[PDB]
Design a protein around this nucleic acid. Sequence first.
DNA 1: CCGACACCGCATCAGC
DNA 2: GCTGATGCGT
DNA 3: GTCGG
Length: 326
Amino acid sequence: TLNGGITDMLTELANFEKNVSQAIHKYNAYRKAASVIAKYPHKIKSGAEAKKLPGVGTKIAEKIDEFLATGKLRKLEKIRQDDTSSSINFLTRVSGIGPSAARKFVDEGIKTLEDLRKNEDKLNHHQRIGLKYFGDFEKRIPREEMLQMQDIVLNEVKKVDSEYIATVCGSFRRGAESSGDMDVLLTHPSFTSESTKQPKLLHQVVEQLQKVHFITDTLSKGETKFMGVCQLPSKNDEKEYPHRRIDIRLIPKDQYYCGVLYFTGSDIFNKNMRAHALEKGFTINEYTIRPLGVTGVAGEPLPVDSEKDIFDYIQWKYREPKDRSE
DNA sequence: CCGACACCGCATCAGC
DNA sequence: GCTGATGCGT
DNA sequence: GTCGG
Ligand SMILES: O=c1ccn([C@H]2C[C@H](O)[C@@H](COP(=O)(O)NP(=O)(O)OP(=O)(O)O)O2)c(=O)[nH]1
Ligand SMILES: [Cl-]
Ligand SMILES: [Cl-]
Ligand SMILES: [Cl-]
Ligand SMILES: [Cl-]
Ligand SMILES: [Cl-]
Ligand SMILES: [Mg+2]
Ligand SMILES: [Mg+2]
Ligand code: NA
Ligand code: NA
Protein backbone atom coordinates (compact mmCIF):
# COMPACT_ATOMS: atom_id res chain seq x y z
CA THR A 1 0.00 0.00 0.00
CA LEU A 2 2.90 2.33 -0.82
CA ASN A 3 0.50 4.27 -3.00
CA GLY A 4 -2.66 3.69 -1.01
CA GLY A 5 -3.88 7.22 -1.60
CA ILE A 6 -3.64 7.07 -5.40
CA THR A 7 -5.15 3.61 -5.88
CA ASP A 8 -8.00 4.66 -3.57
CA MET A 9 -8.68 7.74 -5.71
CA LEU A 10 -8.59 5.72 -8.90
CA THR A 11 -10.89 3.12 -7.37
CA GLU A 12 -13.26 5.83 -6.20
CA LEU A 13 -13.18 7.25 -9.72
CA ALA A 14 -13.89 3.80 -11.17
CA ASN A 15 -16.93 3.42 -8.94
CA PHE A 16 -18.29 6.79 -10.05
CA GLU A 17 -17.94 5.85 -13.73
CA LYS A 18 -19.76 2.57 -13.16
CA ASN A 19 -22.55 3.54 -10.71
CA VAL A 20 -23.20 7.12 -11.86
CA SER A 21 -21.92 7.51 -15.41
CA GLN A 22 -22.76 3.93 -16.34
CA ALA A 23 -19.49 3.96 -18.29
CA ILE A 24 -18.39 0.30 -18.21
CA HIS A 25 -15.09 0.99 -19.99
CA LYS A 26 -13.97 4.01 -17.97
CA TYR A 27 -14.70 1.88 -14.93
CA ASN A 28 -12.53 -0.98 -16.16
CA ALA A 29 -9.89 1.51 -17.26
CA TYR A 30 -9.57 3.01 -13.77
CA ARG A 31 -9.55 -0.44 -12.19
CA LYS A 32 -6.66 -1.50 -14.40
CA ALA A 33 -4.76 1.63 -13.40
CA ALA A 34 -5.32 1.13 -9.67
CA SER A 35 -4.22 -2.46 -10.11
CA VAL A 36 -0.99 -1.85 -12.01
CA ILE A 37 -0.07 0.86 -9.51
CA ALA A 38 -0.84 -1.34 -6.50
CA LYS A 39 1.85 -3.77 -7.63
CA TYR A 40 4.37 -1.02 -8.43
CA PRO A 41 7.21 -1.47 -5.87
CA HIS A 42 8.04 2.24 -5.49
CA LYS A 43 6.32 5.19 -3.82
CA ILE A 44 5.23 7.09 -6.95
CA LYS A 45 6.65 10.63 -7.07
CA SER A 46 4.76 12.02 -10.08
CA GLY A 47 2.20 11.45 -12.81
CA ALA A 48 5.07 11.11 -15.28
CA GLU A 49 6.48 8.18 -13.34
CA ALA A 50 3.03 6.58 -13.24
CA LYS A 51 2.42 7.06 -16.93
CA LYS A 52 5.35 4.72 -17.54
CA LEU A 53 3.03 1.94 -16.44
CA PRO A 54 0.48 0.43 -18.90
CA GLY A 55 -3.07 1.52 -18.23
CA VAL A 56 -1.88 4.80 -16.76
CA GLY A 57 -2.39 7.31 -19.54
CA THR A 58 -2.24 11.11 -19.69
CA LYS A 59 -5.48 11.89 -17.87
CA ILE A 60 -4.67 9.71 -14.87
CA ALA A 61 -1.14 11.12 -14.82
CA GLU A 62 -2.61 14.60 -14.45
CA LYS A 63 -4.81 13.47 -11.59
CA ILE A 64 -1.92 11.83 -9.80
CA ASP A 65 0.06 15.10 -9.94
CA GLU A 66 -2.94 16.94 -8.51
CA PHE A 67 -3.28 14.31 -5.81
CA LEU A 68 0.38 14.43 -4.81
CA ALA A 69 0.49 18.24 -4.64
CA THR A 70 -2.75 18.85 -2.74
CA GLY A 71 -3.51 15.48 -1.26
CA LYS A 72 -6.84 15.31 -3.00
CA LEU A 73 -8.74 15.52 -6.28
CA ARG A 74 -11.15 18.33 -7.17
CA LYS A 75 -13.19 16.08 -9.45
CA LEU A 76 -13.89 13.80 -6.49
CA GLU A 77 -14.52 16.77 -4.19
CA LYS A 78 -17.43 17.80 -6.39
CA ILE A 79 -18.72 14.29 -6.98
CA ARG A 80 -18.90 13.87 -3.19
CA GLN A 81 -21.08 16.98 -2.91
CA ASP A 82 -23.53 16.07 -5.68
CA ASP A 83 -26.52 14.55 -3.87
CA THR A 84 -27.74 12.47 -6.81
CA SER A 85 -24.29 10.91 -7.18
CA SER A 86 -23.93 10.28 -3.45
CA SER A 87 -27.37 8.63 -3.47
CA ILE A 88 -26.69 6.38 -6.44
CA ASN A 89 -23.29 5.40 -5.08
CA PHE A 90 -24.86 4.47 -1.77
CA LEU A 91 -27.76 2.43 -3.18
CA THR A 92 -25.41 0.33 -5.40
CA ARG A 93 -23.86 -0.96 -2.18
CA VAL A 94 -26.93 -3.14 -1.68
CA SER A 95 -26.30 -6.46 -3.42
CA GLY A 96 -28.80 -6.76 -6.26
CA ILE A 97 -29.01 -3.00 -6.75
CA GLY A 98 -26.90 -1.98 -9.72
CA PRO A 99 -26.43 1.41 -11.48
CA SER A 100 -29.80 1.33 -13.26
CA ALA A 101 -32.02 0.32 -10.35
CA ALA A 102 -30.03 2.70 -8.17
CA ARG A 103 -30.76 5.61 -10.48
CA LYS A 104 -34.39 4.49 -10.81
CA PHE A 105 -34.93 4.32 -7.05
CA VAL A 106 -33.45 7.78 -6.61
CA ASP A 107 -35.94 8.93 -9.26
CA GLU A 108 -38.65 7.67 -6.93
CA GLY A 109 -37.38 9.43 -3.82
CA ILE A 110 -35.92 6.21 -2.45
CA LYS A 111 -32.35 7.22 -1.62
CA THR A 112 -31.51 6.10 1.90
CA LEU A 113 -31.24 2.90 3.88
CA GLU A 114 -34.35 4.06 5.71
CA ASP A 115 -36.17 4.49 2.39
CA LEU A 116 -35.30 1.00 1.19
CA ARG A 117 -36.40 -0.74 4.36
CA LYS A 118 -39.85 0.83 4.29
CA ASN A 119 -40.08 -0.01 0.59
CA GLU A 120 -39.22 -3.71 0.45
CA ASP A 121 -42.31 -4.34 -1.67
CA LYS A 122 -40.34 -2.52 -4.37
CA LEU A 123 -37.36 -4.93 -4.34
CA ASN A 124 -36.84 -8.23 -6.16
CA HIS A 125 -35.74 -11.25 -4.10
CA HIS A 126 -31.99 -10.63 -4.39
CA GLN A 127 -32.22 -6.94 -3.45
CA ARG A 128 -34.32 -7.75 -0.39
CA ILE A 129 -31.72 -10.20 0.93
CA GLY A 130 -28.96 -7.71 0.09
CA LEU A 131 -30.77 -5.07 2.17
CA LYS A 132 -31.45 -7.62 4.91
CA TYR A 133 -27.72 -8.25 5.43
CA PHE A 134 -26.47 -4.83 4.41
CA GLY A 135 -24.28 -4.61 7.47
CA ASP A 136 -22.93 -8.16 7.49
CA PHE A 137 -22.11 -8.12 3.76
CA GLU A 138 -19.79 -5.15 4.10
CA LYS A 139 -17.75 -7.03 6.69
CA ARG A 140 -14.58 -9.01 5.89
CA ILE A 141 -14.12 -12.70 6.63
CA PRO A 142 -11.09 -13.62 8.74
CA ARG A 143 -9.19 -16.52 7.15
CA GLU A 144 -9.57 -18.42 10.42
CA GLU A 145 -13.34 -18.19 9.91
CA MET A 146 -12.83 -19.28 6.31
CA LEU A 147 -11.07 -22.38 7.57
CA GLN A 148 -14.06 -23.20 9.77
CA MET A 149 -16.42 -22.64 6.88
CA GLN A 150 -14.28 -24.77 4.54
CA ASP A 151 -14.35 -27.57 7.08
CA ILE A 152 -18.14 -27.53 7.36
CA VAL A 153 -18.69 -27.42 3.60
CA LEU A 154 -16.22 -30.15 2.66
CA ASN A 155 -17.54 -32.42 5.39
CA GLU A 156 -21.21 -31.86 4.59
CA VAL A 157 -20.55 -32.35 0.89
CA LYS A 158 -18.66 -35.54 1.66
CA LYS A 159 -21.69 -36.81 3.60
CA VAL A 160 -23.92 -36.35 0.55
CA ASP A 161 -21.68 -38.28 -1.87
CA SER A 162 -18.09 -39.34 -1.25
CA GLU A 163 -17.45 -38.66 -4.92
CA TYR A 164 -18.09 -34.91 -4.77
CA ILE A 165 -14.99 -32.73 -4.80
CA ALA A 166 -15.27 -29.24 -3.32
CA THR A 167 -12.43 -26.75 -3.51
CA VAL A 168 -12.46 -23.28 -1.91
CA CYS A 169 -11.16 -20.79 -4.46
CA GLY A 170 -11.29 -17.03 -4.86
CA SER A 171 -9.15 -14.94 -2.53
CA PHE A 172 -9.01 -17.80 -0.01
CA ARG A 173 -7.12 -20.01 -2.49
CA ARG A 174 -4.92 -17.00 -3.23
CA GLY A 175 -3.98 -17.07 0.45
CA ALA A 176 -5.77 -13.86 1.50
CA GLU A 177 -5.88 -13.18 5.25
CA SER A 178 -9.48 -12.06 4.82
CA SER A 179 -12.12 -12.60 2.14
CA GLY A 180 -15.15 -10.78 0.82
CA ASP A 181 -16.94 -14.12 0.55
CA MET A 182 -16.51 -17.87 0.21
CA ASP A 183 -16.35 -19.40 -3.25
CA VAL A 184 -16.73 -23.12 -3.78
CA LEU A 185 -15.85 -25.03 -6.93
CA LEU A 186 -17.66 -28.36 -7.03
CA THR A 187 -17.25 -31.46 -9.17
CA HIS A 188 -18.87 -34.88 -9.34
CA PRO A 189 -17.66 -37.67 -11.67
CA SER A 190 -21.24 -37.94 -13.00
CA PHE A 191 -21.22 -34.41 -14.46
CA THR A 192 -18.80 -33.95 -17.35
CA SER A 193 -18.64 -32.00 -20.61
CA GLU A 194 -19.79 -35.36 -21.96
CA SER A 195 -22.92 -36.09 -19.98
CA THR A 196 -24.90 -35.24 -16.87
CA LYS A 197 -25.57 -38.75 -15.61
CA GLN A 198 -27.13 -37.30 -12.46
CA PRO A 199 -29.61 -34.45 -11.84
CA LYS A 200 -29.86 -32.08 -8.85
CA LEU A 201 -26.10 -32.41 -8.34
CA LEU A 202 -25.91 -28.84 -7.03
CA HIS A 203 -29.37 -28.91 -5.46
CA GLN A 204 -28.54 -31.86 -3.23
CA VAL A 205 -25.54 -30.04 -1.85
CA VAL A 206 -27.41 -26.77 -1.33
CA GLU A 207 -30.13 -28.81 0.37
CA GLN A 208 -27.70 -30.59 2.71
CA LEU A 209 -26.06 -27.26 3.58
CA GLN A 210 -29.44 -25.69 4.38
CA LYS A 211 -30.44 -28.72 6.46
CA VAL A 212 -27.50 -28.17 8.83
CA HIS A 213 -28.54 -24.51 8.77
CA PHE A 214 -25.27 -23.47 7.19
CA ILE A 215 -26.96 -21.81 4.21
CA THR A 216 -29.65 -19.34 5.35
CA ASP A 217 -30.72 -17.50 2.19
CA THR A 218 -30.61 -17.76 -1.61
CA LEU A 219 -29.95 -14.84 -3.93
CA SER A 220 -30.16 -16.96 -7.09
CA LYS A 221 -29.91 -20.59 -8.07
CA GLY A 222 -29.53 -22.61 -11.26
CA GLU A 223 -28.19 -26.06 -12.15
CA THR A 224 -24.55 -24.95 -12.07
CA LYS A 225 -24.35 -21.68 -10.12
CA PHE A 226 -25.67 -20.94 -6.65
CA MET A 227 -25.42 -17.51 -5.03
CA GLY A 228 -26.41 -17.26 -1.41
CA VAL A 229 -25.86 -16.65 2.27
CA CYS A 230 -24.30 -18.73 5.02
CA GLN A 231 -23.32 -18.37 8.68
CA LEU A 232 -21.02 -20.33 10.94
CA PRO A 233 -22.74 -21.70 14.04
CA SER A 234 -21.83 -20.18 17.40
CA LYS A 235 -21.34 -21.51 20.93
CA ASN A 236 -23.52 -21.23 24.03
CA ASP A 237 -24.00 -17.56 24.96
CA GLU A 238 -21.57 -16.55 22.20
CA LYS A 239 -22.75 -13.69 19.97
CA GLU A 240 -23.69 -14.81 16.47
CA TYR A 241 -21.29 -14.65 13.53
CA PRO A 242 -22.18 -12.22 10.71
CA HIS A 243 -23.96 -13.65 7.69
CA ARG A 244 -21.59 -14.29 4.77
CA ARG A 245 -22.04 -14.43 0.99
CA ILE A 246 -21.44 -17.84 -0.55
CA ASP A 247 -20.99 -18.74 -4.22
CA ILE A 248 -20.98 -22.34 -5.42
CA ARG A 249 -20.12 -23.33 -8.97
CA LEU A 250 -20.65 -26.84 -10.38
CA ILE A 251 -18.23 -27.55 -13.25
CA PRO A 252 -17.69 -30.61 -15.48
CA LYS A 253 -15.02 -32.72 -13.78
CA ASP A 254 -13.01 -32.97 -17.01
CA GLN A 255 -12.91 -29.15 -17.14
CA TYR A 256 -11.70 -28.70 -13.54
CA TYR A 257 -8.44 -26.90 -14.30
CA CYS A 258 -10.11 -24.21 -16.41
CA GLY A 259 -12.67 -23.90 -13.65
CA VAL A 260 -10.22 -23.68 -10.75
CA LEU A 261 -8.07 -21.22 -12.72
CA TYR A 262 -11.13 -19.06 -13.32
CA PHE A 263 -12.64 -19.34 -9.83
CA THR A 264 -9.28 -18.62 -8.23
CA GLY A 265 -8.89 -15.26 -9.93
CA SER A 266 -8.37 -12.50 -9.31
CA ASP A 267 -10.96 -10.85 -11.56
CA ILE A 268 -8.41 -8.44 -12.98
CA PHE A 269 -5.84 -11.24 -13.30
CA ASN A 270 -8.35 -13.26 -15.32
CA LYS A 271 -9.02 -10.14 -17.38
CA ASN A 272 -5.34 -9.60 -18.15
CA MET A 273 -4.92 -13.33 -18.79
CA ARG A 274 -7.90 -13.66 -21.15
CA ALA A 275 -6.66 -10.58 -22.98
CA HIS A 276 -3.17 -12.01 -23.50
CA ALA A 277 -4.75 -15.28 -24.57
CA LEU A 278 -6.59 -13.36 -27.30
CA GLU A 279 -3.45 -11.54 -28.43
CA LYS A 280 -1.93 -15.02 -28.67
CA GLY A 281 -4.81 -16.41 -30.72
CA PHE A 282 -6.68 -18.28 -28.00
CA THR A 283 -9.75 -17.72 -25.88
CA ILE A 284 -10.27 -18.78 -22.28
CA ASN A 285 -13.38 -19.27 -20.17
CA GLU A 286 -14.08 -21.29 -17.02
CA TYR A 287 -14.54 -24.40 -19.17
CA THR A 288 -11.85 -24.51 -21.83
CA ILE A 289 -9.07 -22.89 -23.78
CA ARG A 290 -9.78 -22.90 -27.50
CA PRO A 291 -7.70 -21.54 -30.38
CA LEU A 292 -9.05 -18.79 -32.63
CA GLY A 293 -9.45 -19.27 -36.38
CA VAL A 294 -8.88 -16.58 -39.00
CA THR A 295 -12.60 -15.84 -39.00
CA GLY A 296 -12.27 -15.34 -35.26
CA VAL A 297 -14.45 -18.30 -34.33
CA ALA A 298 -13.16 -20.43 -31.46
CA GLY A 299 -12.10 -23.98 -32.25
CA GLU A 300 -12.11 -27.28 -30.38
CA PRO A 301 -11.02 -27.31 -26.71
CA LEU A 302 -7.28 -27.94 -26.35
CA PRO A 303 -6.08 -30.67 -23.93
CA VAL A 304 -5.59 -29.42 -20.38
CA ASP A 305 -4.43 -31.45 -17.38
CA SER A 306 -3.12 -28.75 -15.08
CA GLU A 307 -3.42 -25.01 -14.63
CA LYS A 308 0.14 -24.78 -15.92
CA ASP A 309 -0.87 -26.23 -19.29
CA ILE A 310 -3.12 -23.22 -19.74
CA PHE A 311 -0.28 -20.83 -18.94
CA ASP A 312 1.96 -22.71 -21.38
CA TYR A 313 -0.41 -22.29 -24.34
CA ILE A 314 -0.32 -18.50 -23.98
CA GLN A 315 3.46 -18.51 -23.37
CA TRP A 316 3.12 -17.29 -19.80
CA LYS A 317 5.31 -18.59 -17.00
CA TYR A 318 3.29 -20.26 -14.26
CA ARG A 319 2.10 -18.07 -11.42
CA GLU A 320 1.08 -19.60 -8.10
CA PRO A 321 -2.40 -18.59 -6.83
CA LYS A 322 -0.76 -16.27 -4.29
CA ASP A 323 0.82 -14.33 -7.15
CA ARG A 324 -2.42 -13.77 -9.10
CA SER A 325 -3.73 -11.06 -6.75
CA GLU A 326 -4.19 -8.18 -9.16
C1' DC B 1 -7.04 8.12 -35.56
C1' DC B 2 -10.20 4.40 -33.82
C1' DG B 3 -11.91 -0.02 -32.83
C1' DA B 4 -11.29 -2.91 -28.86
C1' DC B 5 -11.72 -3.53 -24.11
C1' DA B 6 -12.92 -11.22 -20.67
C1' DC B 7 -16.37 -14.11 -20.03
C1' DC B 8 -20.78 -15.98 -18.57
C1' DG B 9 -25.00 -17.96 -15.08
C1' DC B 10 -29.39 -16.62 -13.27
C1' DA B 11 -33.27 -13.22 -12.75
C1' DT B 12 -36.36 -10.51 -15.15
C1' DC B 13 -38.40 -8.28 -18.88
C1' DA B 14 -40.65 -7.32 -23.63
C1' DG B 15 -42.58 -9.31 -27.68
C1' DC B 16 -44.55 -13.01 -29.97
C1' DG C 1 -44.70 -20.97 -23.33
C1' DC C 2 -40.08 -19.71 -26.08
C1' DT C 3 -36.32 -16.33 -27.25
C1' DG C 4 -33.54 -12.64 -26.96
C1' DA C 5 -31.99 -8.18 -24.67
C1' DT C 6 -30.62 -6.20 -20.39
C1' DG C 7 -29.33 -5.90 -15.39
C1' DC C 8 -26.30 -7.66 -12.19
C1' DG C 9 -22.64 -9.91 -10.09
C1' DT C 10 -19.38 -13.29 -11.74
C1' DG D 1 -9.58 6.18 -20.16
C1' DT D 2 -5.96 3.73 -22.50
C1' DC D 3 -4.00 1.03 -25.85
C1' DG D 4 -1.83 -1.04 -30.60
C1' DG D 5 -1.78 -1.07 -35.44
O1 LIG E 1 -15.79 -10.05 -12.75
C1 LIG E 1 -15.47 -11.14 -12.28
C2 LIG E 1 -15.68 -11.56 -10.93
C3 LIG E 1 -15.13 -12.70 -10.50
N1 LIG E 1 -14.35 -13.51 -11.30
C4 LIG E 1 -13.73 -14.74 -10.79
C5 LIG E 1 -12.31 -14.50 -10.25
C6 LIG E 1 -12.58 -14.32 -8.76
O2 LIG E 1 -11.42 -14.56 -7.98
C7 LIG E 1 -13.65 -15.38 -8.54
C8 LIG E 1 -14.47 -15.25 -7.28
O3 LIG E 1 -15.30 -14.10 -7.33
P1 LIG E 1 -15.35 -13.07 -6.11
O4 LIG E 1 -16.24 -11.95 -6.51
O5 LIG E 1 -15.72 -13.89 -4.93
N2 LIG E 1 -13.80 -12.55 -5.98
P2 LIG E 1 -12.58 -12.90 -4.95
O6 LIG E 1 -12.91 -14.10 -4.15
O7 LIG E 1 -11.28 -12.86 -5.67
O8 LIG E 1 -12.51 -11.73 -3.99
P3 LIG E 1 -13.32 -11.53 -2.73
O9 LIG E 1 -12.50 -11.99 -1.58
O10 LIG E 1 -13.83 -10.13 -2.73
O11 LIG E 1 -14.53 -12.40 -2.82
O12 LIG E 1 -14.50 -15.24 -9.70
C9 LIG E 1 -14.11 -13.16 -12.63
O13 LIG E 1 -13.43 -13.84 -13.39
N3 LIG E 1 -14.70 -12.00 -13.04
CL1 LIG F 1 -17.37 3.50 -21.21
CL1 LIG G 1 -9.86 13.20 -3.36
CL1 LIG H 1 -9.60 -28.19 -17.97
CL1 LIG I 1 -16.50 -23.56 -23.73
CL1 LIG J 1 -19.28 -17.73 -11.28
MG1 LIG K 1 -14.60 -14.52 -3.44
MG1 LIG L 1 -17.81 -14.94 -4.81
NA1 NA M 1 0.90 4.30 -19.54
NA1 NA N 1 -25.10 -3.48 -5.72
